[PDB]
C-alpha cells in the first residue's frame, strides 16, 4: 500500500513493428520486413548531380538567379488576371528623406568601374 | 478502456445538459433523450463493473518482477548457449560444403 | 479535468534506450545518406558471393567446348582462349535471379592485321553487352545462350 | 541431393541462429533494471500533462 | 550560475524539437558556424537518464541525433522540409493514438 | 444555440450512441476484504505470483463475463447489457500494440 | 510589441566558439525549481494530486473505488432528477445554484477515481509485459531447441543418405 | 522601424480569438508597429460603439477592406479630407494571424531584380575567374571509327536475328 518499494525491473525495447513511412489521410505503411537472410545479399549489392565536381558554385548561382526570375514572373502572371490577387493603386508616395540617390549613384559607379579597371589591367 | 469510461461519464452529462436545453427551448425528443441517458448510464455501470478492487501491484509486483528478472537472465543464457552451438553448425558445415566444392572444382 | 493514457512502451523506450523507435523513419531515409561498409564486410560479402556463384555454377550445364572458369573471388571469368571472353555473375537468390554480363572482351587480337589497336569498335562490343545480357536475363538456358 | 538437404536444413538453421544472435547482440544481453516502478510512472504523469507527445 | 545554464539549455533543447525553430536557425546561418556543431556535441549530455528525467517534451532527443549527421543541417533550410517533418510528426502522433482507438472499437463492433 | 431542428437533434442521438455503444453481462465481482499487500499482509505468497501468471484470477488477470467465456486484459470484450440488437464493445484494457 | 520570435542564438554558443579544450561542461541536475516553457514544473511531486487540495471530499478513506464510483453514478442521476424538481417548483429558488454546483462536484470525484485507476493501470503494466516477454523468450528457445533437433534430424538424414547412395 | 515592409508582428494568444470585428480590434491593439498611437485610430480605441467616426470630421483611420472568414483579413489605411472623400494610404494584409504590409508593384519588382542581377554578377565573376584562356594559343586548364565497323554491325544484326531480345 503506502510507501511503494521500487525494485530492479528490466523491460525489453518494444520494437515489434516500425512505421517507416506515414501517409496522409491515415493509411499506415509497415515497410520494415524484419529480415537478415536476404539482408546479406542486400548489403552485397552495396559492396550531387552528373559529375558536378567542377563549376559547382557557378551552376548553383545561375540556378538560384533563374529561380528568382521565375518567382517574379509567376507573381506577374498571377497579377495578369484577377484570380486570387489584386492591384488596387493606394495613392501613396515613396518619400526618401535624404540625399540617398546622389551618394548611392556615385558609390555604385565607383565600385563598378573599379571592377572593370581591375579586369582590364589583369588581362 | 479508461478513456472510453471518461468519455462515457462526460457524455452522461451531455445528455443531461442537452435534455434540459431542449426542455427550455416534442414527446419523441423527450423519449429519445430518456432512452439515450438510460442506455449510457447502464453502459457506464457495466464498464465500471469491469475494473476491479485489485491487489498486489508491489508486494506481488516486486516479487514477480524479481522472479522475471532472474528467469530472463537464465533464459538469455539458455538461448545463447543454444546460439553459440547453433552458429557453430553453419560455421564449418558451410566450410564442409566449401570442401566439397573445392574437391569438385579441383577435378 | 479528464486525465489521459500513460506513455507505457513509449516511456520505456525513453528511459532505457534513446533511439526513438516511434513516428516515421522516412525522415532519415530521405534526408540522411547511408554509411558505407568497411573491408571487414566488403570482402566478407565478396566470399559469400564466391560460395553462391559456386552453387549456381555446379547447378547448370557448362559447355564442354572450353568453359575456362576461375572464381576470381567475384567473377566466374568465362574465357575462351580463342576469340571470346565474358564474365557472368549472379545478383542474389539461386532460384530465380538473372545473370550479369559485365565484361565482353573479344580475344581475337592479331598483331599482323590490327597494329596498335583492337579489332572491332567498342560500341559494337557494348551492343552485345546489352544484347547477350538481355538474352541471359531470359533465365532460359543462359550458360549455353 | 545432400547439398539441397544441407541448404534447407541450414536456412532453417540461419533463421534460428539469427533468433539466437538477435539475442546475443541485444535482447537477453543488457538486461538492465535501472529505473522502473517509480520514474516511469513519474514520466507517465509527465507526458500525460504534456499533450504534444500525448 | 550553473542553474541558469541548466535552465537555458533545457529550454533550448526542448525548443529544438520544433521544425519551425530549426528552419529559423538553418536559414539564419547559425548551423554553418563550426561553433554550433560543437555546442550540439556538448548538448548530448541529455541522453543520460538523470538529465532526461527533467525533459518534458521528449521528441527533441532523437531530433538532436539527426543534427549530428552533418547532412541534416546542410538541408532543412527549405520550408518544405519543416512542412514535411512536422506533417510526419503530427501524423505519427495523432494517427497512432486515434487509429489504435478506432481499430479497437471498429473490430469490437464488427465481431459482435 | 437555438438548434432543435429535427435534423440537428437527430445527429446528436447517433453521435452520442456511437461513443457509448438475456444479459451477457460480466459476472458480479464480490468485494475482497484482504488485498495482496495491505489487506492480507500476505506480502508475496509465491502462490499469488503463480496464480497471476497462469491461473484464472477473476479480477487481477481478467474479466469472467457470463456464458463462461473468459476475456484477458489484452482481449476486447463484446457484450450486450441492454435487451436490444446494439452491443457494447469494451476495447482492450492494456492495448499492447 | 518590440519582442521578435524570441532572441536568437547567444551566450552558450559564444562560449562554445573555442577549440580542443576550452568549452564549459554540462550543468548539474538542479533537483529543485526550474522554468521550462512558462510553468515552474518543479521536481518532487505525486501523480494524482489529492482532491482535498482545491475542492471538498464527499468520500471516506475506505474509498472502495468500485463501490463509490457506482454510488456517484447514482447520485448524479438522482441529482439531475432533483434539478428537474427545482424547475417544477421554483426556477428562481437559491437551491438552483447549489444543485448546479453539487452535480459538478459529483462529476469531479468520478475523475479523481479514474485518476486512481490510471496508476492502478501503470502499476499493472509495469508488472505484466515482462510476462509476455517471458513467454516469448521461452517459446523462441523451444523453437531453437526443436530446430536444432530437426537440424540433427537432417544430420541423421545425411547419415541415411550415405547408405542410401551405397 | 527600419523598413515597415520587412516587419511581421503576431500574438499566438490572440490567434484563437479571431474572425471579423475581432480583426479590427487586434489591429487596434497598440504594440503593432503599423498602428499609430497618434492620428484618429487611437481615439476610436477610446470611443465606444462608434458607427461613422471616419466621415463628418476626418483623419487617419484603419478599416477592413476584404475578409475571408478563416484567415484572410485585409486592412486599408485611409486619410479623409471630408465625409465622402477618401484617400488610400497603404494596405496591410493578415494571413494566418500574421500581419504583413502589401508590397508595392514597382518597389517589389525592382528589389527582387536587384537580388537576381547580383546573383548573375557573382556567377559572371566565377566564369571570368575559371575562364582566363591563355593568350599564347592555350587554355587555362586550372579553371571515332576504325571503319571496320560495317562488318561488326552486320554481326550485330546477325546475333540480333539469332538471339532475339526478350523483355
Amino acid at each position: 500500500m503506502s510507501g511503494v518499494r521500487a525494485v530492479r525491473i528490466s523491460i525489453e525495447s518494444a520494437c515489434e513493428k516500425q512505421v517507416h513511412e506515414v501517409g496522409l489521410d491515415g493509411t499506415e505503411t509497415y515497410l520494415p520486413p524484419l529480415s537478415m537472410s536476404q539482408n546479406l545479399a542486400r548489403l552485397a549489392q552495396r559492396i550531387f548531380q552528373p559529375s558536378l565536381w567542377p563549376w559547382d558554385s557557378v551552376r548553383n548561382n545561375l540556378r538560384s538567379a533563374l529561380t528568382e526570375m521565375c518567382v517574379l514572373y509567376d507573381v506577374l502572371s498571377i497579377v495578369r488576371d484577377k484570380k486570387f490577387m489584386t492591384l488596387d493603386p493606394v495613392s501613396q508616395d515613396a518619400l526618401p528623406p535624404k540625399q540617398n540617390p546622389q551618394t548611392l549613384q556615385l558609390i555604385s559607379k565607383k565600385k563598378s568601374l573599379a571592377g572593370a579597371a581591375q579586369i582590364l589591367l589583369k588581362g | 478502456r479508461l478513456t472510453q469510461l471518461q468519455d462515457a461519464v462526460n457524455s452522461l452529462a451531455d445528455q443531461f445538459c442537452n435534455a434540459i436545453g431542449v426542455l427550455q427551448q416534442t414527446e419523441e425528443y423527450a423519449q429519445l433523450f430518456a432512452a439515450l441517458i438510460a442506455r449510457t448510464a447502464k453502459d457506464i455501470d457495466v464498464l465500471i463493473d469491469s475494473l476491479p478492487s485489485e491487489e498486489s501491484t508491489a508486494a506481488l509486483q516486486a516479487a514477480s518482477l524479481y522472479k522475471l528478472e532472474e528467469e530472463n537472465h537464465e533464459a538469455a543464457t539458455c538461448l545463447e548457449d543454444v546460439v553459440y552451438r547453433g552458429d557453430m553448425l553453419l560455421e564449418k558445415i558451410q566450410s564442409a560444403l566449401a570442401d566439397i566444392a573445392q574437391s569438385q572444382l579441383k577435378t | 479535468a479528464r486525465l489521459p493514457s500513460f506513455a507505457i512502451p513509449y516511456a520505456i523506450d525513453v528511459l532505457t534506450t534513446g533511439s526513438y523507435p516511434r513516428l516515421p523513419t522516412c525522415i532519415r531515409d530521405k534526408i540522411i545518406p547511408p554509411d558505407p561498409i568497411t573491408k571487414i564486410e566488403k570482402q566478407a560479402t565478396l566470399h559469400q558471393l564466391n560460395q553462391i556463384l559456386r552453387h549456381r555454377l555446379v547447378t547448370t550445364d557448362l559447355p564442354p567446348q572450353l568453359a575456362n572458369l576461375t572464381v576470381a573471388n567475384g567473377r566466374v571469368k568465362f574465357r575462351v582462349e580463342g576469340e571470346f571472353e565474358a564474365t557472368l555473375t549472379v545478383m542474389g537468390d539461386d532460384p530465380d535471379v538473372p545473370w550479369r554480363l559485365l565484361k565482353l572482351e573479344i580475344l581475337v587480337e592479331d598483331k599482323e592485321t590490327g597494329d596498335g589497336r583492337a579489332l572491332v569498335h567498342s560500341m559494337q562490343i557494348s551492343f552485345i553487352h546489352q544484347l547477350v545480357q538481355s538474352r541471359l536475363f531470359a533465365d532460359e538456358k543462359p550458360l549455353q545462350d | 541431393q545432400l547439398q539441397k538437404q544441407l541448404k534447407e536444413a541450414e536456412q532453417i538453421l540461419a533463421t534460428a541462429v539469427y533468433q539466437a544472435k538477435e539475442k546475443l547482440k541485444s535482447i537477453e544481453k543488457a538486461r538492465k533494471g535501472a529505473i522502473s516502478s517509480e520514474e516511469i510512472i513519474k514520466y507517465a504523469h509527465r507526458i500525460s500533462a504534456s499533450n504534444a507527445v500525448c | 550560475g550553473n542553474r541558469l545554464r541548466f535552465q537555458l539549455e533545457l529550454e533550448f533543447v526542448q525548443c529544438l524539437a520544433n521544425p519551425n525553430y530549426l528552419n529559423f536557425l538553418a536559414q539564419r546561418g547559425y548551423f554553418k558556424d563550426k561553433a554550433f556543431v560543437n555546442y550540439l556535441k556538448y548538448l548530448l549530455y541529455w541522453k543520460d537518464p538523470e538529465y532526461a528525467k527533467y525533459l518534458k517534451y521528449p521528441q527533441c532527443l532523437h531530433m538532436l541525433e539527426l543534427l549530428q549527421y552533418e547532412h541534416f543541417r546542410k538541408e532543412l533550410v527549405n520550408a518544405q522540409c519543416a512542412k514535411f517533418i512536422d506533417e510526419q510528426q503530427i501524423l505519427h502522433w495523432q494517427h497512432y493514438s486515434r487509429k489504435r482507438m478506432r481499430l479497437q472499437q471498429a473490430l469490437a463492433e464488427q465481431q459482435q | 444555440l437555438s438548434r432543435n431542428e429535427i435534423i440537428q437533434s437527430y445527429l446528436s442521438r447517433q453521435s452520442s450512441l456511437l461513443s457509448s455503444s438475456a444479459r451477457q453481462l460480466h459476472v458480479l465481482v464480490p468485494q475482497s476484504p484482504p488485498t495482496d499487500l495491505p489487506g492480507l499482509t500476505r506480502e508475496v505468497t509465491q502462490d499469488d505470483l503463480d496464480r497471476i501468471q497462469a491461473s484464472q484470477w477473476p479480477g487481477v488477470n481478467g474479466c469472467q463475463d457470463t456464458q463462461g467465456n473468459w476475456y484477458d486484459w489484452t482481449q476486447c470484450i463484446s457484450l450486450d447489457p441492454h435487451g436490444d440488437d446494439g452491443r457494447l464493445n469494451i476495447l482492450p484494457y492494456v492495448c499492447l500494440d | 510589441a518590440l519582442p521578435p520570435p524570441m532572441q536568437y542564438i547567444k551566450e552558450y554558443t559564444d562560449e562554445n566558439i573555442q577549440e580542443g579544450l576550452a568549452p564549459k561542461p554540462p550543468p548539474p541536475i538542479k533537483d529543485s525549481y526550474m522554468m521550462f516553457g512558462n510553468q515552474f514544473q518543479c521536481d518532487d511531486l505525486i501523480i494524482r494530486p489529492l482532491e482535498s487540495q482545491g475542492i471538498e471530499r464527499l468520500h471516506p478513506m475506505q474509498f472502495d473505488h468500485k463501490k463509490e464510483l457506482r454510488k456517484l453514478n447514482m447520485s448524479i442521476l438522482i441529482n439531475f432528477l432533483d434539478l428537474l424538481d427545482i424547475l417544477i417548483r421554483s426556477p428562481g429558488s437559491i437551491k438552483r445554484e447549489e444543485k448546479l454546483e453539487d452535480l459538478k462536484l459529483l462529476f469531479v470525484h468520478v475523475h479523481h477515481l479514474i485518476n486512481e485507476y490510471r496508476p492502478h493501470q501503470a502499476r499493472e503494466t509495469l508488472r505484466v509485459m515482462m510476462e509476455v516477454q517471458k513467454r516469448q523468450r521461452l517459446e523462441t528457445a523451444e523453437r531453437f531447441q526443436k530446430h536444432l533437433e530437426r537440424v540433427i534430424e537432417m544430420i541423421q538424414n545425411c547419415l541415411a543418405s550415405l547408405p542410401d547412395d551405397l | 522601424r527600419d523598413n515597415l515592409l520587412g516587419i511581421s508582428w503576431v500574438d499566438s494568444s490572440w490567434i484563437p480569438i479571431l474572425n471579423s470585428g475581432s480583426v479590427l480590434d487586434y489591429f487596434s491593439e497598440r504594440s503593432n508597429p503599423f498602428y499609430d498611437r497618434t492620428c484618429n485610430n487611437e481615439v476610436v480605441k477610446m470611443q465606444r460603439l462608434t458607427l461613422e467616426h471616419l466621415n463628418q470630421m476626418v483623419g487617419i483611420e484603419y478599416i477592413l477592406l476584404h475578409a475571408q472568414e478563416p484567415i484572410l483579413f485585409i486592412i486599408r489605411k485611409q486619410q479623409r479630407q471630408s465625409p465622402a472623400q477618401v484617400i488610400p494610404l497603404a494596405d496591410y494584409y493578415i494571413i494566418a494571424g500574421v500581419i504583413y504590409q502589401a508590397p508595392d508593384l514597382g518597389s517589389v519588382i525592382n528589389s527582387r531584380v536587384l537580388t537576381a542581377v547580383h546573383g548573375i554578377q557573382s556567377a559572371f565573376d566565377e566564369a571570368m575567374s575559371y575562364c582566363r584562356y591563355h593568350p599564347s594559343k592555350g587554355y587555362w586548364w586550372h579553371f571515332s571509327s576504325i571503319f571496320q565497323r560495317q562488318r561488326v554491325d552486320a554481326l550485330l544484326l546477325d546475333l540480333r536475328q539469332k538471339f532475339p531480345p526478350k523483355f
Side-chain angles (χ1 to χ4, degrees), chain A residues 1-46 48-123, chain B residues 1-94 96 98 101, chain C, chain D residues 1-31 33-54, chain E, chain F, chain G, chain H residues 1-47 50-138 144-167:
Chain A
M1 183 176 282
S2 198
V4 182
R5 180 187 49 90
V7 225
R8 233 49 180 182
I9 292 136
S10 194
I11 308 172
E12 182 147 320
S13 171
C15 160
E16 49 117 72
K17 250 155 91 183
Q18 222 147 28
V19 36
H20 157 56
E21 160 68 303
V22 207
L24 309 146
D25 300 86
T27 83
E28 261 340 59
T29 93
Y30 285 67
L31 243 238
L34 323 205
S35 159
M36 145 271 143
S37 71
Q38 294 87 18
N39 187 34
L40 60 93
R42 296 175 225 160
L43 296 174
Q45 194 277 327
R46 288 222 277 142
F48 188 70
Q49 215 203 24
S51 264
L52 250 287
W53 230 194
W55 314 22
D56 181 1
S57 58
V58 220
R59 219 174 89 271
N60 243 294
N61 284 38
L62 244 193
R63 177 120 96 275
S64 149
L66 180 167
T67 220
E68 146 64 7
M69 255 343 305
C70 240
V71 145
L72 173 122
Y73 168 101
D74 290 346
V75 149
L76 259 249
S77 151
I78 256 160
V79 175
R80 152 64 87 43
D81 311 313
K82 294 346 194 33
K83 220 147 48 143
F84 333 101
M85 218 19 101
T86 39
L87 191 80
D88 94 298
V90 145
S91 262
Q92 213 246 311
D93 36 70
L95 47 94
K98 214 234 226 176
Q99 49 65 221
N100 309 9
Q102 301 68 61
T103 26
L104 196 118
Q105 236 62 348
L106 206 224
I107 275 8
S108 189
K109 267 282 169 335
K110 291 211 171 317
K111 280 146 149 243
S112 99
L113 277 138
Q118 248 307 319
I119 283 222
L120 255 194
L121 263 252
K122 233 173 253 211
Chain B
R1 291 193 179 188
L2 293 174
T3 316
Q4 289 193 6
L5 190 151
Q6 292 164 304
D7 290 11
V9 168
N10 287 18
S11 160
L12 180 63
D14 203 50
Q15 293 124 7
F16 294 150
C17 98
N18 200 203
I20 306 150
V22 168
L23 197 326
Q24 227 216 341
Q25 166 281 333
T26 57
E27 69 286 339
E28 69 265 50
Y29 295 77
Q31 290 159 359
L32 67 90
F33 266 117
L36 250 55
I37 286 151
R39 169 134 189 148
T40 71
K42 187 154 293 183
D43 293 2
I44 289 182
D45 302 323
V46 69
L47 200 148
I48 289 176
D49 279 328
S50 83
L51 326 164
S53 314
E54 300 142 55
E55 16 252 317
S56 77
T57 84
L60 278 295
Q61 185 64 60
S64 86
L65 70 88
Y66 197 51
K67 299 296 183 181
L68 285 174
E69 187 80 358
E70 304 153 351
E71 295 210 14
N72 278 151
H73 298 338
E74 69 93 11
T77 53
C78 166
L79 70 89
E80 75 185 4
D81 284 341
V82 203
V83 63
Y84 120 83
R85 126 85 182 153
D87 304 330
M88 242 256 100
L89 278 142
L90 122 116
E91 272 151 35
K92 110 212 153 221
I93 226 237
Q94 102 102 59
Chain C
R2 280 207 217 99
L3 45 122
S5 61
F6 296 164
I8 332 163
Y10 280 103
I12 288 181
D13 174 40
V14 172
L15 293 189
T16 56
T17 195
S19 75
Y20 262 0
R22 215 14 73 93
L23 282 131
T25 56
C26 313
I27 317 151
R28 170 177 289 190
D29 306 292
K30 292 186 181 186
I31 304 166
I32 300 305
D35 298 352
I37 51 181
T38 58
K39 288 84 185 62
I40 316 160
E41 329 88 332
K42 290 181 2 142
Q43 276 72 78
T45 49
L46 202 44
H47 87 73
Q48 274 117 46
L49 251 288
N50 265 124
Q51 218 34 68
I52 308 153
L53 242 190
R54 283 156 170 256
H55 311 327
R56 155 80 38 127
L57 272 175
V58 304
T59 57
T60 2
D61 43 340
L62 55 88
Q65 318 211 31
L66 271 103
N68 280 47
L69 75 168
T70 61
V71 300
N73 86 16
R75 304 149 190 86
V76 290
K77 284 189 70 66
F78 285 162
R79 158 147 179 158
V80 62
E81 72 95 40
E83 61 261 330
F84 186 56
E85 165 66 29
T87 60
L88 267 182
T89 185
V90 285
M91 186 56 209
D93 56 86
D94 213 18
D96 215 353
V97 70
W99 303 64
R100 300 182 60 191
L101 194 58
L102 314 180
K103 202 174 182 183
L104 279 300
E105 186 178 2
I106 339 236
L107 273 262
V108 252
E109 33 85 68
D110 194 54
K111 300 283 156 128
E112 285 69 25
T113 326
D115 1 51
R117 212 150 288 165
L119 202 245
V120 115
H121 230 359
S122 49
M123 64 102 77
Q124 295 295 100
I125 300 171
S126 96
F127 239 108
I128 9 144
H129 162 71
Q130 24 114 134
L131 250 145
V132 296
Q133 190 141 347
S134 69
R135 291 193 297 274
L136 67 91
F137 273 111
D139 294 0
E140 313 170 8
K141 294 301 297 299
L143 269 208
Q144 298 292 336
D145 281 8
Chain D
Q1 306 143 13
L2 260 47
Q3 161 265 145
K4 309 178 194 75
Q5 185 60 20
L6 65 87
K7 214 150 296 298
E8 272 292 329
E10 274 80 331
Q11 107 196 194
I12 292 308
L13 256 36
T15 69
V17 296
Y18 294 159
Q19 170 255 172
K21 285 188 308 97
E22 178 32 61
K23 289 170 144 183
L24 295 178
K25 271 64 175 183
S26 298
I27 134 178
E28 295 278 63
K29 176 218 80 257
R31 302 307 306 129
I35 278 179
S36 35
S37 56
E38 191 275 314
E39 224 294 278
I40 305 203
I41 313 194
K42 215 56 260 287
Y43 249 28
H45 182 214
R46 179 255 347 175
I47 197 55
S48 74
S50 175
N51 331 333
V53 194
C54 157
Chain E
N2 298 339
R3 295 174 64 190
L4 304 182
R5 294 177 67 191
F6 170 86
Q7 293 198 6
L8 289 183
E9 277 150 357
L10 185 143
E11 299 272 17
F12 176 76
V13 183
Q14 282 180 5
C15 280
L16 190 147
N18 172 222
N20 288 326
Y21 185 57
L22 276 184
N23 186 28
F24 187 89
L25 290 185
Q27 288 187 352
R28 261 76 171 169
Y30 286 103
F31 292 163
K32 283 207 168 187
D33 202 308
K34 297 186 177 183
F36 200 84
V37 303
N38 298 338
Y39 183 70
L40 289 172
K41 285 282 299 181
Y42 152 74
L43 271 186
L44 262 290
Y45 76 104
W46 285 104
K47 288 195 165 189
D48 301 358
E50 57 261 49
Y51 291 108
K53 191 204 169 185
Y54 304 106
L55 278 159
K56 184 178 179 180
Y57 284 54
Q59 293 177 335
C60 69
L61 288 91
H62 170 263
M63 216 66 184
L64 179 62
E65 293 177 350
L66 273 297
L67 263 63
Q68 294 177 335
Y69 275 95
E70 273 288 335
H71 195 282
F72 197 77
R73 286 185 261 92
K74 196 198 297 181
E75 280 204 34
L76 187 137
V77 190
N78 301 117
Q80 315 178 312
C81 171
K83 169 65 61 153
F84 167 81
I85 176 70
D86 210 35
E87 283 283 324
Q88 272 195 349
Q89 281 188 2
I90 300 187
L91 269 181
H92 170 269
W93 186 40
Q94 194 193 180
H95 185 85
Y96 195 67
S97 159
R98 282 293 84 73
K99 182 70 167 65
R100 178 66 183 270
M101 188 175 178
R102 288 179 205 173
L103 190 139
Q104 207 61 32
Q105 275 203 357
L107 188 56
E109 285 202 4
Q110 283 175 40
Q111 283 212 12
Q112 276 212 1
Chain F
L1 186 140
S2 70
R3 307 160 196 174
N4 276 62
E5 279 203 330
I6 321 166
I7 309 174
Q8 287 196 45
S9 70
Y10 269 100
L11 299 172
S12 81
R13 285 95 221 211
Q14 306 197 13
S15 53
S16 66
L17 278 183
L18 286 191
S19 71
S20 74
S21 60
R23 283 176 162 184
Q24 194 187 184
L25 212 146
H26 300 68
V27 131
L28 189 274
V29 180
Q31 62 98 9
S32 303
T35 50
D36 296 18
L37 192 214
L40 194 32
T41 334
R42 71 177 90 177
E43 282 191 3
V44 10
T45 310
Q46 179 76 225
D47 284 357
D48 327 356
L49 319 194
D50 295 349
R51 269 226 283 161
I52 176 188
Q53 290 172 34
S55 97
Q56 289 189 353
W57 205 320
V60 181
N61 327 343
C63 316
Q64 211 313 255
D65 193 22
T66 39
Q67 297 173 11
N69 323 5
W70 168 273
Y71 299 88
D72 66 37
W73 296 116
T74 67
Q75 286 157 353
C76 343
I77 320 187
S78 69
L79 101 146
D80 180 26
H82 336 272
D84 295 290
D85 186 359
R87 276 202 160 76
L88 211 188
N89 290 347
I90 312 189
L91 264 43
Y93 184 63
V94 188
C95 209
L96 227 177
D97 219 30
Chain G
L2 353 144
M6 110 175 205
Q7 222 277 318
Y8 341 104
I9 251 58
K10 239 274 296 302
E11 290 186 10
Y12 305 146
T13 75
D14 300 341
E15 211 283 332
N16 237 300
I17 196 167
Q18 328 104 359
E19 241 357 297
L21 135 58
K24 46 59 241 23
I29 291 125
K30 270 91 208 216
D31 289 298
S32 48
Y33 289 53
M34 41 176 302
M35 266 280 306
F36 135 109
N38 318 328
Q39 317 75 340
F40 251 82
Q41 297 209 343
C42 34
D43 249 17
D44 284 318
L45 234 154
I46 6 215
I47 306 78
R48 58 225 187 178
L50 328 169
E51 161 138 2
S52 72
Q53 310 179 15
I55 357 208
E56 292 223 2
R57 149 163 195 143
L58 304 183
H59 42 50
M61 310 315 298
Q62 302 165 306
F63 231 19
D64 281 5
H65 328 244
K66 285 184 72 165
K67 297 188 181 184
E68 286 199 331
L69 266 174
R70 209 168 302 95
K71 264 191 176 181
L72 283 179
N73 159 256
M74 258 341 295
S75 79
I76 276 148
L77 292 148
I78 278 179
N79 285 32
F80 179 60
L81 282 169
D82 288 20
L83 222 215
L84 283 185
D85 296 12
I86 277 309
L87 286 180
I88 322 181
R89 271 79 174 287
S90 167
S93 51
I94 316 78
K95 306 178 180 186
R96 151 184 164 257
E97 318 298 7
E98 311 175 40
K99 223 68 200 197
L100 279 166
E101 175 265 66
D102 205 10
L103 43 94
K104 191 175 180 177
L105 192 50
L106 311 172
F107 304 144
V108 175
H109 291 107
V110 173
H111 290 290
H112 178 73
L113 265 356
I114 303 161
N115 214 162
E116 304 280 318
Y117 279 121
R118 243 300 152 181
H120 298 342
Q121 168 143 25
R123 298 178 73 177
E124 163 272 347
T125 66
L126 298 175
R127 191 194 336 178
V128 301
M129 179 159 3
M130 236 33 207
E131 290 173 357
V132 168
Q133 190 50 40
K134 195 195 78 315
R135 172 223 313 163
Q136 279 185 358
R137 297 179 185 179
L138 294 184
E139 263 200 344
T140 60
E142 172 227 25
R143 289 158 192 150
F144 184 171
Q145 251 213 320
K146 108 177 310 177
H147 272 235
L148 173 155
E149 295 312 350
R150 211 274 182 88
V151 166
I152 294 205
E153 234 59 24
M154 263 250 175
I155 287 184
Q156 76 210 51
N157 138 74
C158 184
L159 186 53
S161 297
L162 177 68
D164 193 307
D165 116 80
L166 256 75
Chain H
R1 281 197 182 186
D2 295 332
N3 195 358
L4 295 185
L5 284 169
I7 306 186
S8 313
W9 172 85
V10 258
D11 187 11
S12 300
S13 62
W14 211 285
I15 296 181
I17 176 63
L18 225 264
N19 44 88
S20 17
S22 17
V23 145
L24 277 319
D25 290 345
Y26 188 29
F27 204 86
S28 303
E29 294 177 350
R30 204 265 87 196
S31 301
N32 180 45
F34 312 128
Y35 182 77
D36 338 293
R37 357 150 110 214
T38 58
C39 81
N40 288 44
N41 226 72
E42 198 54 89
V43 218
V44 239
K45 261 235 332 263
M46 254 159 290
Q47 248 272 336
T50 119
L51 249 335
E52 62 276 293
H53 284 228
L54 346 105
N55 21 282
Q56 193 244 285
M57 230 288 284
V58 286
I60 282 185
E61 299 281 34
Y62 295 94
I63 188 55
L64 196 147
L65 188 151
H66 174 272
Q68 199 198 35
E69 276 307 319
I71 51 162
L72 292 171
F73 289 104
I74 301 100
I75 314 297
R76 176 211 287 244
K77 179 178 181 175
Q78 321 177 340
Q79 173 45 273
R80 287 204 194 192
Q81 183 65 260
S82 81
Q85 284 185 323
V86 184
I87 303 179
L89 262 290
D91 292 329
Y92 307 93
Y93 65 99
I94 304 182
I95 292 177
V98 190
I99 312 186
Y100 320 91
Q101 185 190 178
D104 306 358
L105 193 45
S107 303
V108 81
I109 293 178
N110 296 343
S111 59
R112 63 210 275 188
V113 161
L114 142 86
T115 75
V117 181
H118 167 258
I120 302 178
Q121 166 61 41
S122 307
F124 165 76
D125 194 17
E126 188 302 1
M128 184 303 300
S129 182
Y130 261 38
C131 289
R132 260 151 319 139
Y133 194 94
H134 287 125
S136 50
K137 65 194 198 163
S144 80
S145 164
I146 67 160
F147 277 102
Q148 212 257 337
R149 181 177 65 83
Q150 73 276 59
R151 179 60 178 163
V152 188
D153 181 65
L155 161 71
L156 284 185
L157 273 292
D158 175 285
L159 63 94
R160 277 200 220 170
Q161 303 147 38
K162 263 49 153 186
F163 289 84
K166 196 148 48 193
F167 308 110

